[PDB]
Design a protein around this ligand. Structure first.
Ligand SMILES: [Mg+2]
Ligand SMILES: [Mg+2]
Ligand SMILES: [Mg+2]
Ligand SMILES: [Mg+2]
Ligand SMILES: [Mg+2]
Ligand SMILES: [Mg+2]
Ligand SMILES: [Mg+2]
Ligand SMILES: [Mg+2]
Ligand SMILES: [Mg+2]
Ligand SMILES: [Mg+2]
Ligand SMILES: [Mg+2]
Ligand SMILES: [Mg+2]
Ligand SMILES: [Mg+2]
Ligand SMILES: [Mg+2]
Ligand SMILES: [Mg+2]
Ligand SMILES: [Mg+2]
Ligand SMILES: [Mg+2]
Ligand SMILES: [Mg+2]
Ligand SMILES: [Zn+2]
Lengths: 69, 223
RNA sequence: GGGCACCACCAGGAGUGGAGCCUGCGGCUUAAUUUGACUCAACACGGGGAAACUCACCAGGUCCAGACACAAUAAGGAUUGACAGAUUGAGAGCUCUUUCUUGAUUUUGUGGGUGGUGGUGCAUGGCCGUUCUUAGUUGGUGGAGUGAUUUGUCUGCUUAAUUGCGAUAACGAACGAGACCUUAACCUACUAAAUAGGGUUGCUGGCACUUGCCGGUUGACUCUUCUUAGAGGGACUAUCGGUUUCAAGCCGAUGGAAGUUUGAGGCAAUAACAGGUCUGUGAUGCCCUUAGACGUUCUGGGCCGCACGCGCGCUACACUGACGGAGCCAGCGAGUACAACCUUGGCCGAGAGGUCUGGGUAAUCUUGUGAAACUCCGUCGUGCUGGGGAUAGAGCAUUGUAAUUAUUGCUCUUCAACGAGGAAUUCCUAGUAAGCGCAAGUCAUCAGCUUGCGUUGAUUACGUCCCUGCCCUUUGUACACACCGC
RNA sequence: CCAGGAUGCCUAGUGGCAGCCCCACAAUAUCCAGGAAGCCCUCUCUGCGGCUUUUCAGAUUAGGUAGUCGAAAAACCUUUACCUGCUAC
């Protein structure tokens, strides 16, 4: 057979940078809750917006926002 | 449904072939030989010839039922329109496929091959073949391949007396060292063939003549 | 010495080899122009006419399809997903920009599989090819040998044939050949038909105009010759003549549809070959490989490149023609409902091809596939000419996602080589050869290919061992891996 | 690769529908047998296949030996030959 080419640069699947008990949401009083950012208009509450410099999206609908918030 | 008649026929044939193949694959332990398909209105009768009929059956409708279900799944039929039956084979030794299967099984088990072949031949003879032949091909010891032929009686090679008379049976056998190719030809006796001619085309048996007494006067015998 | 064969030659035909062009295969070239196979038995073969797919090759990227076992994270996430533009060949989240999703699938290891048009056909199966479709092969007694063995299985003559007749330590047998089977031929003899064809007659069109001629209509009635295709017969070398130990047979006349094994095939023994195929194969041993794969999968190419060799092929070198009209006749087939098949009939278009409509799942419709080569009357007359059609340029079409490295078709234009091809060598013996087209196969689209089909239809043998091969016999053999020997 | 200059019988032909109208058959020698491109060859304008090599390998296959092929610098214009592979109830 013919020899393999060998440029060098390999690309692996990203490990994702997992993070839980994320700093979204808050509570001040104790009794009631204070939501941070916002929930989805398309789907029901529980899902939360992605916040960037005048650009939003959500993951349950893979990524489908446009309007600011 | 509703196609060119010839095309339909072809399709049916293909289906049958597939079924046969499946049976060969699956009913190895059971010692399957051949299928018989009767396509009437509503119901379709799938008859199965195997050695271990009981095994095929299971325990009053189980394995057979499963098979039926599988068939239905394959070919878009409904429950009721397929009917399987597992029947015995009238004389196993006259069958060729069955013999081949048996041989394969023996090989798998681990028996002296030549001896096994001889035994098979003997069995065939007992059953009542005019003659039979077994070829076992491959690496029967050593790396170099050999063919091993074991035969008894007559063996018609040429002509139409082959499709009519000789049942053939090929079957590969997988082992640790490699593959063994088993072929079996069983020349059924003409008298017990039923379908087609009951005798060879070249043989001309002449009946024995009957004696008479000449003269004994002119005479008469009136009523 | 004796056989046999148009894969041998005679007697002839058609040729190929030359010409151009197709296509195989070398050689070179190229990232890569994937590979298998080289006397017959490699070279239009791999059903291999590659536009991607196919595909194995190259440049590049994607994906896990890493089964299962066992631990490291075990939700303070295992890993799954992810629009936006840069990114990217690129509306490949391929990612690095991102900060949202996903919930224990996984995943990180370690046993363990799995896939591979990776390797090895000189590790195998099966299938195929070839010795060989030649006439060869075997054993049971019995005889000859201590024996391996031998005879049978053979001087002769026959036959396509170890086919027979004969002669005979051989007798009777089996396989192979033959028989067999399928098809191709005959049936005014049967069984049959508005899915096959006719006859009378109704209505009905035209004629001559007497009653007669051609028609068109599934209007009626009836038939089975042609049709089909069921069951049977029929050919057995039959009758006669010679010829041959008056045998096997062969040769000639007669009749007969048939007298070449009636023609053509299908199958086709023993023993084999280091023949081919591990690129048909969830046929497979072992090796290799085995998560940036030699797995897969996308994307763009490539098998098609050209100083040049050979191999199948087509087109022509014209006057037995060319071109126009006109005449006008086959047989094998094949053909869709979950697809897009064959596609008449009507209109548009010089064409190709478009359109509307049908008919057909098919002796019904395409289809009488009114195929060509042919036949008739005219135009050019033996000039590289109107022979010949290559290379060329342009446009018009179609197939498909994609046509440049013209896919193919059509339209105009360009008009090259080649005045029957040297040494060589192929094929052939009758509905054959050669010509001619059709036909399916592959097929979205492409025929110069192929398996068949019919149409037109000859010349010359009907022998021989000169060559070539093969077969036997007798001989010789320091060979037995067997002359590529020793 | 070449061509005829003239001493001459030529001969105003013989055949096939002679007729002019085409076909074929008939005219010794030739004297020269001569000219043009190519012509054994040697230096140049200084060519691409040798020289060794060192790196490897393609492989050549059933296995192996000896040679050969492929990518990198220096003067000169073959992939074959040969060794070795297998047995009874
Ligand atoms: Mg690669
Ligand atoms: Mg026989
Ligand atoms: Mg036969
Ligand atoms: Mg041959
Ligand atoms: Mg090609
Ligand atoms: Mg060919
Ligand atoms: Mg193509
Ligand atoms: Mg594969
Ligand atoms: Mg493999
Ligand atoms: Mg082999
Ligand atoms: Mg080989
Ligand atoms: Mg004896
Ligand atoms: Mg002998
Ligand atoms: Mg006679
Ligand atoms: Mg015949
Ligand atoms: Mg028809
Ligand atoms: Mg011209
Ligand atoms: Mg082709
Ligand atoms: Zn959403």
């Amino acid at each position: 057979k013919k020899v393999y080419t060998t440029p060098k640069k390999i690309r692996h699947k990203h490990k994702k940078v997992k993070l839980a008990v994320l700093n979204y949401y808050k509570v001040d009083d104790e009794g009631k809750v204070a939501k941070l950012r916002k929930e989805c208009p398309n789907c029901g509450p529980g899902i939360f917006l992605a916040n960037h410099g005048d650009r939003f999206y959500c993951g349950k609908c893979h990524s489908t926002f446009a309007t600011q918030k | 449904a509703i196609i060119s008649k010839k095309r339909k026929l072809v399709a049916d044939g293909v289906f049958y072939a597939e079924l046969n193949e499946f049976f060969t694959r699956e009913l190895a332990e059971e010692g399957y030989s051949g299928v018989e398909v009767r396509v009437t209105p509503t119901k379709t009768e799938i008859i199965i010839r195997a050695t271990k009929v009981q095994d095929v059956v299971g325990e009053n409708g189980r394995r057979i039922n499963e098979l039926t279900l599988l068939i239905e799944k394959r070919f878009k039929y409904k429950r009721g329109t397929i009917a399987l039956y597992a029947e015995r084979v009238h004389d196993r030794g006259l069958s060729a496929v069955a013999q081949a299967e048996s041989m394969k099984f023996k090989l798998l088990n681990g028996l002296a091959i030549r001896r096994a072949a001889y035994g098979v031949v003997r069995y065939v003879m007992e059953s009542g073949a005019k003659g039979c032949e077994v070829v076992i091909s491959g690496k029967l010891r050593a790396a170099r391949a050999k063919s091993m032929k074991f035969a008894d009686g007559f063996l018609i090679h040429s002509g139409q007396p082959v499709n009519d008379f000789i049942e053939t049976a090929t079957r590969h056998v997988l082992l640790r060292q490699g593959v063994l190719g088993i072929k079996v030809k069983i020349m059924k006796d003409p008298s017990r063939n039923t379908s087609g001619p009951k005798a060879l085309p070249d043989a001309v048996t002449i009946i024995e003549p009957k004696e008479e007494e000449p003269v004994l006067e002119p005479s008469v015998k009136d009523y």
